[PDB]
RNA sequence: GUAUAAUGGCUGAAGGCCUCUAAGCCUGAAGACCGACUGCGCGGUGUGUGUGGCGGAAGACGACCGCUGUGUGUGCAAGC
RNA sequence: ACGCUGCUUUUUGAUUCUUCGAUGUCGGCUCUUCCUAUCAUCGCGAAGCAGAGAUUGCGAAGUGUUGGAUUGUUCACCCACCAACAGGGAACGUGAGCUGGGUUUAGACCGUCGUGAGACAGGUUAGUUUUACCCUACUGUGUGGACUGUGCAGCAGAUC
RNA sequence: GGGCGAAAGACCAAACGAACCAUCUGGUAGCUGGUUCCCUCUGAAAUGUCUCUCAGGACAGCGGCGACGGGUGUAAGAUGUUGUAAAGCACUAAUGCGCUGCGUUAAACUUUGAAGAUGUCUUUUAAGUUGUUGCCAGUGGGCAUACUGUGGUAAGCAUGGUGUGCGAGAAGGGAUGAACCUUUAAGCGGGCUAAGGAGUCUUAUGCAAGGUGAAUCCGGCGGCCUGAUUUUGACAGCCGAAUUGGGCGGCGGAGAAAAUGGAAGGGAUUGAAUUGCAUUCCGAUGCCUGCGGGGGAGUAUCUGAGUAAGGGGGCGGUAUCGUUCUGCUGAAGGUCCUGCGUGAGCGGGGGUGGAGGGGCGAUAUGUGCAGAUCUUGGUAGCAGUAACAAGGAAAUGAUUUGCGCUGGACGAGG
RNA sequence: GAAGUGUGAAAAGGAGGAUGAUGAGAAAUGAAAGUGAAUGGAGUGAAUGGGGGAUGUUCCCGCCCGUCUUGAAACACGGAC
């Protein structure tokens, strides 16, 4: 009855039920806390996943601590981020039932990629603008803008249909938030005006899909011994006689992957443009940010990009949401990068810079 | 067939003694709305009321909590559930009686100049513990309710603009009074009275 | 992040003295509640969906993500 | 100490109310959940508490509590590690989940008992593990836009 | 009841520790299952004796149906019997001291001795109003409770005594329950109560006083009983007025630890879960009162629950003899609609059908179905599901090409 | 060691369908279980029943029969129609 040899349970109940996500662009669950003693800025951005590579880094300890300088090799992810466009304003007031949204201000000319997302692909078949601006100034506890991406600048996605979202505006004086966004309607805002190097960031996206999966893979339970009749990939006992029902905490077979996940404390390493040479490294060569042959199953990076440390949710060409940290951050160690690898990721590439391959063989 | 409507105000009212009387009105075909639902009180100490709400939260279907009992933390939703369990609500005569009830925190805007009533037996000053009680809004804010400062605001703004409307009305009662005591006034009205 | 348990304290009677307690107050836990994170119903709104075909990052079948002729073939690049 | 008063339902008895036109009877392996009468980890008292190491008490069930030799064993007993290697319930949890070593009809050997056919909770060896395609439960999936609010339900890091 | 066996009780035409086929044979069964229409009047036992008797039977007890026939299941006045409870030491058996008293006991001890039981006389005491006999059934596992014993650490344990219940007893109440409290049985009206209750589910009012599971400990109260101290200055540490020790009766707090989330019936309640009250009210199929129906009775009336079981009066199938009618101008059967009857059942109307069908009296019976792992026939759900097949191609296919391995003769059997 | 009788007075005639002919009549009668088509009403509650009222429901009451048994709605047995 009482069960000798205890062990931890297999998997977490924080994420049950494990359903598919209902959308490819999940909306953020919270926004940072407004400090109205700063200038006005934005708190997020949307980009697209390209691929992974190397970097070598010098661990600054050159004080006479027993290890002056170490080398450290770290994996990174590259995301391609063309500039976004602002086309609206939104305010929220406070009631006894919570946040109530006020009528919305549209700019002068809504793009053709914003109309396909709102009304489908076959959509083609004033002072009232000024009165609505006064409400967001009298009322409106908090303010947000409506932004959209420009997927037609990355012609390996094949979209023409934009992703749109609401992003909070931080910085004080609600009448100052509004007039900063009135002088920005129909114009672009770039990712270098939002995030900076050596900062911690959050990501939000959807994971790689796997379909219908067995229970050895979905939860990590043991296999049965080799003599066993009726198969070995399964759980042996799904409950006691009483209660005379199966519980929600038992492991079963079903959908694995394509879930909504939020990850936190990813460190930013570099911010550049794809149509120029990456540098700030301590070696001489030119080397744009894209490997020999290209990123596998992706084209080249020709717009702005951002580089962060480690793994990042999702598949190649899928959209991701970037958010500023909600926690307290201390400093960040000093970052010194001195080499970025750009060999071929198809096979075992041994050259950087195809001109270097051309001078090895001769002809 | 009935079409009567009553607005009930709960500010110093014992919550159980009000619920038992509001449910007998609903069964006899009267429409009720209870306003200021966060100001009803519970006789006793806050340590005794938190221990009783904590045992309520413990009740939970182990097999599948999505089928299980649902614990509401809003004052308007919680006091509506006390009235529901005063009666047999699974049967069709009880389903109809629950269609005649509305509950609010604070006072909504449409019910601004209409008269409110109190229940004569639920005043906390008739018990032996006047000055030892907890309001429904302080107890529930310690388990998750957020909008307690936005409810006191909305009620005072309506009270003040319901007091100004009383000053305009009272002064006209004095200007009309002098007209009734006039000279050309009476000799006129005595003519209309003359033709019966 | 807020309020607490055991314990330790402040002011203070009953009981002219005394006392952390009867009214009140300060502090305090891998615990409680809340936040953050995932899922579902219901609401609101200057807002209501490409019949078919073809693809995929999606998929047992339904569904989901895309376009509305830009495929196939061939050349170069990058690899075994 | 000598005496006296209780609680639990984990032992083994006592009883014979339910089931003999059948409720699959020991242990292990696998997997989930609950109790506190707390072993470790967090907070805090006492001392015949100098320090160090331990001993005794209170709040507290969130998270942990292992790898081997001999035995079918439960149990037991040793070796090594460890923050620590606590105790229990769920039809003595769990055989249309497995395995079948114990028990285990029909073959056989030994000891004791019987004139004999045969007997022994005495030892030994060889001995078929059937069927879901139904209802419910549970896991996904379907039940006809775009951007969001807010109620309910779940819930994660722990230790050296 | 024989065979055959390098032996396993193996094998002898898919069952072998005694094959198969027909008969005797509807073999016997103290054991299991089933046993067919309505209304109405009465109504049990689960105990004693004997039994190869113990899951059975006989005899006796309790009940039904009769028939015939004239004259006390309670008390009072008198007078007998008894050896328990309690108590006691007079006998039998026990038990401490002091050197005559004090102390402790008894199912198998009794000098005493109840309450209660039990005989007889007198209706020439009260109050009330049966004898003899015939033919026969079911039953012989009981159980609960108030009070009262015996065995057992104890038990929803086992076994006795007296009454009343369930059994064979509905209905109202106790949230729910065979047995608890009220009360004994659904016709149509009018009145009133019982148990239990009157915030809300849910029919229906108030007034008052306190308050906010064991040993073993702690506190309180305009409560009560008993003592002590004090204006000649107490108690506490000069001050100016009450201070204090033991107990008792209500009330509260420690002692107080279990396994899915959970229960004064629930939401709740500071008296809407405590105590004391009554001048109001609600509440049965019970009571009173007016009609209707049955059965008794000596004919102004009284009386209705019921298993096992027994008696009276009715409804329906098929025929005979014994009388009396109807059908081609459309019978029976079948289907829908409609009247009468407490009921078993009996009539009429419109389609369909295409040849016979009834009433009343006596008489003969293979005479009435929901059940028997009932017999035979037909039909559902499961379910368009499990299972099985879809063999390499070329518009055509006597042509081209791709794959597999049995191929050809005699006998038995067909 | 079974199961299986019936066009009509007359063949006066049919036998895939449709259009027709003959006949007094398309032709022994033709129940229940169960099903298809059309049309009226209701539903997301297991269903079904009694009282009281009504062109479905809303209030009250109501666990599945037969049997053995001290005792059955029974996690006692028999029972798809």
Automatic annotation (TrEMBL), chain B:
One of its GO terms (molecular function) is mRNA binding. It holds the Pfam family Ribosomal_L13. InterPro entries: Ribosomal_uL13, Ribosomal_uL13_euk/arc, Ribosomal_uL13_sf. Belongs to the universal ribosomal protein uL13 family. The keyword Ribonucleoprotein applies. It comes from Encephalitozoon cuniculi (strain GB-M1). Keywords: Ribonucleoprotein, Ribosomal protein. PANTHER family: LARGE RIBOSOMAL SUBUNIT PROTEIN UL13 (PTHR11545:SF3), RIBOSOMAL PROTEIN L13 (PTHR11545). GO terms for biological process: negative regulation of translation; translation. It comes from the Eukaryota. One of its GO terms (cellular component) is cytosolic large ribosomal subunit. SUPFAM superfamilies: Ribosomal protein L13. This is 60S RIBOSOMAL PROTEIN L13A (L16). Gene3D superfamilies: Ribosomal protein L13.
């Amino acid at each position: 009855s009482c069960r000798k040899f205890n062990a931890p349970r297999h998997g977490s109940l924080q994420f049950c039920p494990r359903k598919r996500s209902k959308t490819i662009r999940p909306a953020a669950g919270a926004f940072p806390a407004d400090d109205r003693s700063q200038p006005v800025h934005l708190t997020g951005f949307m980009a697209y996943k390209a691929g992974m590579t190397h970097v070598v880094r010098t661990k600054t300890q050159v004080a006479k601590n027993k290890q002056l300088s170490r080398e450290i090799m770290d994996a990174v992810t590259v995301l391609e981020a063309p500039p976004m466009v602002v086309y609206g304003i939104v305010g929220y007031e406070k009631t006894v039932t919570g946040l109530r949204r006020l009528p919305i201000v549209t700019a002068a000319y809504v793009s053709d990629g914003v109309l396909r997302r709102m009304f489908g692909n076959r959509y083609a078949s004033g002072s009232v603008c000024e009165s609505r601006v006064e409400m967001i100034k009298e009322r409106a506890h908090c303010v947000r803008v409506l932004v959209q991406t420009q997927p037609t600048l990355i012609k390996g996605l094949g979209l023409k249909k934009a992703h749109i979202a609401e992003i909070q505006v931080n910085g004080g004086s609600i009448s100052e938030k509004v007039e900063w966004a009135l002088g920005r309607l129909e114009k672009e805002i770039a990712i270098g005006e939002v995030f900076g190097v050596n900062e911690n960031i959050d990501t939000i996206g959807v994971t790689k899909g796997k379909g219908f999966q067995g229970t050895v893979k979905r939860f990590g339970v043991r296999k049965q011994p080799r003599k066993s009749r009726k198969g070995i990939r399964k759980v042996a006992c799904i409950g006691a006689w009483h209660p005379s029902r199966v519980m929600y905490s038992i492991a079963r077979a079903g959908q694995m992957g394509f879930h909504r996940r939020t990850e936190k404390n990813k460190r930013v390493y570099m911010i550049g443009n794809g149509s120029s040479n990456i540098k700030t490294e301590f070696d001489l060569t030119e080397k744009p940010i894209s490997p020999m042959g290209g990123f596998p199953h992706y084209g080249e990076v020709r717009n702005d990009f951002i580089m962060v440390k480690g793994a990042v949710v999702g598949a190649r060409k899928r959209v991701v949401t970037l958010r500023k940290s909600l926690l307290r951050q201390r400093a960040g160690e000093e970052l010194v990068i001195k080499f970025v690898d750009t060999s071929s990721k198809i096979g075992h590439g041994r050259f950087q810079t195809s001109a270097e391959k051309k001078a090895f063989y001769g002809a | 067939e009935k079409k009567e409507h009553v607005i009930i105000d709960a500010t110093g009212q014992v919550a159980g003694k009000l619920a038992a009387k509001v449910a007998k009105l609903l069964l006899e075909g009267v429409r009720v709305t209870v306003v200021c639902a966060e100001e009803a009180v519970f006789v006793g100490s806050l340590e005794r009321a938190m221990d009783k709400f904590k045992q309520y939260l413990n009740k939970r279907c182990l097999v599948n909590p999505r089928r299980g009992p649902f614990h509401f933390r809003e004052p308007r939703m919680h006091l509506a559930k006390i009235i529901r369990r005063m009666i047999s609500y699974k049967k069709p005569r009880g389903k109809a009686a629950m269609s005649r009830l509305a509950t609010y925190e604070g006072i909504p805007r449409e019910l601004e100049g209409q008269p409110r009533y109190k229940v004569t037996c639920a005043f906390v000053k008739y018990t032996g513990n006047p000055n030892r009680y907890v309001t429904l809004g302080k107890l529930l804010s310690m388990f998750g309710w957020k909008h307690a400062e936005a409810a006191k605001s909305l009620t005072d703004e309506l009270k003040e603009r319901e007091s100004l409307a009383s000053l305009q009305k009272k002064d006209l009662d004095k200007k009309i009074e002098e007209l009734k005591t006039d000279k050309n006034f009476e000799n006129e009205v005595n003519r209309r009275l003359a033709m019966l």
